[PDB]
């Protein structure tokens, strides 16, 4: 199920996700998917005026079933959405490089 995915962290808070993502070993683009406290994608990123920071994206769910962050691309599962943005940032701050430990 989704709970067998190592990138899925359940219903954690934004503060907890930033605490998990932002340590000094996690590379730029480390990420996790969490349930909204429908899902949220949280990604670490670096910029000079901010340093290493987390961006949070809402993953919207269609009534017909698919998921999307931009209307430009939609997916039938969270697994396909994570696969796509691991290959292409395509508007996200950074490509998904590393599953958060």
């Amino acid at each position: 199920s989704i709970q067998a995915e190592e990138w899925y962290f359940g219903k954690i808070t934004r503060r907890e996700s930033e605490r998990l993502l932002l340590n000094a070993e996690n590379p730029r683009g480390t990420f996790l998917v969490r349930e909204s406290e429908a899902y949220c994608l949280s990604v670490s990123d670096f910029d000079n005026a901010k340093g290493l920071n987390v961006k949070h994206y809402k993953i919207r769910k269609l009534d017909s079933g698919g998921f999307y962050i931009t209307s430009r691309t939609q997916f039938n599962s969270l697994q396909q959405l994570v696969a796509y943005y691991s290959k292409h940032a395509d508007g996200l701050c950074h490509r998904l490089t590393t599953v958060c430990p």
Binding site: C40, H56, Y57, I69, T70, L92
Partner: peptide, 4 residues
């Protein structure tokens, strides 16, 4: 939440 960031809008892409």
């Amino acid at each position: 939440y960031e809008e892409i």
